[PDB]
C-alpha cells in the first residue's frame, strides 16, 4: 500500500501569506496520479489539483502544485479567508487508492493563554449513579493544550474525553471542554478534584480544583 504522509499537521498563517503544504509518498508515485483536495467543515471535499500541478475546473490561480522526487507540494500563494480549511493529497496509481492524513490551515494570531474553570457534578446528576466533572479551557491560541485530571493527587487516564470548538470567527481562538466520567460511588470515595492545564501561553501549568462537599 502506498502511504502518503502530509506535513506539517497544522499550518498557522495570516490572510495574504503564502501556504506551502507537503505530501510524501512511501514509494515512487508518477506525477499524473497525485491529486489535492480542499475540505471545509460540514462540506464535501473539492478537487483542487490533479496530475501534481494541474488546476481543476474553476480553481483560482493562487493554487499551484509541484513535484520533487517522492515529495509533492501544494502552494497557496496568497491566503484568502475562504482558504482556511483542511487539505488532503491522494494517489490513484496503485490499488488501494490512498489519501494523506490531511493538513489543517488555521488563522495565525498572538499567543493567548486559556482561562481555566472546573465544574463539579450537580446534585441532580448524582441521583443517577454517574458523576461528570467538567474542565473548561476558554479562548486560547494555539490549538495545542494538555489537560490532566487528578483525583486525590492520583493522575487519571482513560476516563476523560475532550471536545474543541472551531476557531472563533471574531478572535481566532479555540475553546476546549474535558469531561471526567466516574461512577457516583467512585466520586464519593475521593475528596480533591483537579484539572491541570499546560499551554504555551502559561508561564507555569494552571491547576483548578475543588473539594467534594465544600463551598
Amino acid at each position: 500500500e502506498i502511504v502518503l504522509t502530509q506535513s506539517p499537521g497544522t499550518l498557522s498563517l495570516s490572510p495574504g501569506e503564502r501556504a506551502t503544504l507537503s505530501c510524501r509518498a512511501s514509494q515512487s508515485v508518477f506525477s499524473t496520479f497525485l491529486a489535492w483536495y480542499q475540505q471545509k467543515p460540514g462540506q464535501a471535499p473539492r478537487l483542487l489539483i490533479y496530475a501534481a500541478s494541474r488546476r481543476a475546473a474553476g480553481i483560482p490561480d493562487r493554487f499551484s502544485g509541484s513535484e520533487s522526487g517522492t515529495d509533492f507540494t501544494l502552494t497557496i500563494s496568497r491566503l484568502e479567508p475562504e482558504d482556511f480549511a483542511v487539505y488532503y493529497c491522494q494517489q490513484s496509481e496503485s490499488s488501494p487508492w490512498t489519501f494523506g492524513q490531511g493538513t489543517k490551515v488555521d488563522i495565525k494570531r498572538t499567543v493567548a493563554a486559556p482561562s481555566v474553570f472546573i465544574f463539579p457534578p450537580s446534585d441532580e446528576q448524582l441521583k443517577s449513579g454517574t458523576a461528570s466533572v467538567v474542565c473548561l479551557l476558554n479562548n486560547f491560541y494555539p490549538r495545542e493544550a494538555k489537560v490532566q485530571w487528578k483525583v486525590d493527587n492520583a493522575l487519571q487516564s482513560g476516563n476523560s474525553q475532550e471536545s474543541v470548538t472551531e476557531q472563533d470567527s471574531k478572535d481566532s481562538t479555540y475553546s476546549l471542554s474535558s469531561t471526567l466520567t466516574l461512577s457516583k460511588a467512585d466520586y464519593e470515595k475521593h475528596k480533591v478534584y483537579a484539572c491541570e492545564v499546560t499551554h504555551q501561553g502559561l508561564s507555569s501549568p494552571v491547576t483548578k480544583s475543588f473539594n467534594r462537599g465544600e463551598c
Binding site: 488501494p96 487508492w97 450537580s122 475553546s175
Partner: protein
C-alpha cells in the same frame, strides 16, 4: 451541470441492513467510474472502492471488502453502498464521487472531480431519547466567571442550545457532541460572564432536542452552602 445527489441521513442499530444511494445527472453515467469514500467523525478520508457502471464488477480497498458492497443500476443513473449487518464502527459520513481519467484507453485515473454532498450514517444500540440537562455552576472565584449546561444522554444528534432565549450570545461556546460508549451523545454549552453579574443576572440555557420533541429551560445559579 454535473451533480451527484446522495440519499438522506440514516440512524440504525447494529445488525441492521442499509443501502445508501448516489443519483447522478449532467453526464453519461456509464462513461466514468464512481468511487465511495468514508470519513469518520473528526477523521480523514478513506477510499472504499470503485465501480464502472454497467460492467458491474466492483473493485474494493482490501480493508473494506466483504463487509460492504458497491453496486450500480445504469438504468436509473444510481450507484449504491450496501451493508447486510451494520456495526457501531460504520458510524461515519459517506461520499460518492465521479472519477476522471485518460481518454486513450490507458486505464489511468487522476482523481475525484465531482463529489456528492455526503450521507451521515449513525449506528447505535440506542433508541430516540431526550437529554438530561445539568447545571455547570459557577465557582466562588480579571473578574470573569464561567457557567454552563451539561446536555447528557440523548439520541440521535442534534441538540440546539441558546442562552437567555437568544439574548445572550457573546462569550457562548456550545461544544461538538461526543458519542459515549453507551451509544448516547453528550455535550456541554458554556458562557463566560462578568463575575459581578452572578446572582444579579438570571442565566438560563434553552435546550431543544427536535427528534424527541424535548425542550428544557435550565436556570444556572452559583451553588449555595
Amino acid at each position: 451541470e454535473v451533480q451527484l445527489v446522495q440519499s438522506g441521513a440514516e440512524v440504525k442499530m447494529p445488525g441492521e441492513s442499509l443501502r445508501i444511494s448516489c443519483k447522478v445527472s449532467g453526464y453519461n453515467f456509464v462513461k466514468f467510474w464512481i468511487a465511495w469514500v468514508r470519513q469518520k467523525p473528526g477523521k480523514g478520508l478513506e477510499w472504499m472502492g470503485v465501480i464502472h457502471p454497467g460492467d458491474s464488477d466492483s473493485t474494493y480497498n482490501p480493508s473494506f471488502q466483504g463487509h460492504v458492497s458497491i453496486s450500480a443500476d445504469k438504468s436509473i443513473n444510481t450507484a449504491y453502498l450496501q451493508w447486510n449487518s451494520l456495526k457501531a464502527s460504520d458510524t461515519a459520513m459517506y461520499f460518492c464521487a465521479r472519477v476522471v481519467g485518460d481518454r486513450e484507453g490507458f486505464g489511468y485515473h487522476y482523481g475525484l472531480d465531482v463529489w456528492g454532498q455526503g450521507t451521515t450514517v449513525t449506528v447505535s444500540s440506542a433508541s430516540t431519547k431526550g437529554p438530561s440537562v445539568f447545571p455547570l455552576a459557577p465557582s466562588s472565584k480579571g473578574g470573569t466567571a464561567a457557567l454552563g449546561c451539561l446536555v447528557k444522554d440523548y439520541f440521535p444528534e442534534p441538540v440546539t442550545v441558546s442562552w437567555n432565549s437568544g439574548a445572550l450570545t457573546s462569550g457562548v461556546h456550545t461544544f461538538p457532541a461526543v458519542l459515549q460508549s453507551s451509544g448516547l451523545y453528550s455535550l456541554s454549552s458554556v458562557v463566560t460572564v462578568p463575575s459581578s453579574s452572578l446572582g444579579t443576572q438570571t442565566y438560563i440555557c434553552n435546550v431543544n432536542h427536535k427528534p424527541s420533541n424535548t425542550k428544557v429551560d435550565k436556570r444556572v445559579e452559583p451553588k449555595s452552602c
